[PDB]
């Protein structure tokens, strides 16, 4: 009847997101924690930041966890919130949003219940995150110059490689240097989105190590070439697609190029990103090995 002492919950919403369902079903979802022993307090988002701001007071409050409700941008702004702070409260994801790149990636139930009972069961994994200068990201970043936009929105796979213009870069990857012509780079963290099931095929979520893809200046066969080889998870079979994990990577040019941070512009170049291993503490379910995870010890081996 009652397991475990009295622990402290504090959900984000962003009653926009997605459907726009959960806030009314919000008031079902606190009688579904209070019975699972969490005194749960809500906040609901009114604009862009607002979750970072709430996530940022929330670090002084004492929660156990904080759950979030919402898309990537929701949860995305949770984490900038909490990133690199001591006495973090582990992370609950309602996937509310129109795309969850980051609930996909971890398994997370696309159900409000089911989303609760994964949070409630209490199993957590550790996840990677990325440092970006002075900001931080979940799933990705991505970087280039069009020709003569859509890094303003949510990136789906290599689908704007033939918009790219040929732009001479530098990209310092863990004492590597790529220095040439790219029309496009990406930093991975998760590892599908829209125009990828596997944006590479053996990324993991928790190995320390950012998916660094650098697409080279390629003529019209090559750019042809790729495109036909991404359509069948085979763009990395490519000479002009380098792939490479790197935990630290700076990157620079004395051209302008337009960043992409979580299907959000990210402002400009220069850009020092760094992997920050296992950062994040989020619960995950019990009954599901996940294949991008080294570490699966939240799951229970009997299920
Ligand atoms: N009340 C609100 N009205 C409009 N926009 C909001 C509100 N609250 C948050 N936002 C912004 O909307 C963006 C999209 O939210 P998200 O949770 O990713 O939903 P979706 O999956 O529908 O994009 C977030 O990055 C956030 O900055
Ligand atoms: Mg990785």
Redesign the pocket.
């Known amino acids: 009847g009652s397991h475990m002492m009295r622990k402290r919950a504090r959900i984000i919403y ?5 459907k726009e369902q959960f806030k009314r079903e919000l008031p079902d979802a606190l009688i579904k924690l209070e019975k699972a022993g969490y005194e749960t307090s809500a906040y ?8 970072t701001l709430e996530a940022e007071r929330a670090m002084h409050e004492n929660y156990d966890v904080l759950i979030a409700a ?8 949770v984490v900038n919130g909490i990133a690199e702070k001591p006495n973090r409260p582990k992370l609950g994801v309602i996937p ?5 790149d980051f609930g996909r990636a971890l398994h997370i139930p696309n159900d409000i219940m089911g989303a609760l009972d994964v949070i409630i069961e209490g199993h957590s994994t550790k996840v990677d995150i990325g440092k970006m200068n002075n900001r931080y990201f979940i799933n990705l970043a991505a970087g280039g110059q069009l020709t003569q936009g859509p890094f303003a929105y949510y990136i789906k796979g290599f689908e704007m490689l033939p918009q790219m213009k040929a732009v001479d870069l530098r990209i310092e990857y863990d004492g590597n240097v790529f220095q040439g012509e790219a029309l496009l780079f990406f930093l991975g963290l998760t590892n599908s989105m829209a125009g990828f099931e596997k944006l590479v095929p053996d990324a993991k979520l928790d190995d320390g190590y950012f998916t660094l893809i650098i697409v080279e200046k390629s003529n019209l066969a090559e750019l042809g070439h790729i495109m036909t080889l991404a359509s069948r998870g085979e763009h990395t079979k490519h000479p002009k697609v380098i792939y490479e994990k790197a935990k630290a990577i700076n990157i620079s040019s004395f051209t302008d190029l337009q960043l992409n941070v979580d ?2 512009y990210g402002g400009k170049l220069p850009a020092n990103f760094l992997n920050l291993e296992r950062h994040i503490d989020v619960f995950a379910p019990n009954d599901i090995v996940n294949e991008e995870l080294i570490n699966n010890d939240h799951v229970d081996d009997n299920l």
């Open positions: 962003n009653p926009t997101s997605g609901a988002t009114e604009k862009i930041g607002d979750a919402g898309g990537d941008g929701t949860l995305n702004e509310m949003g129109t795309v969850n299907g959000e």
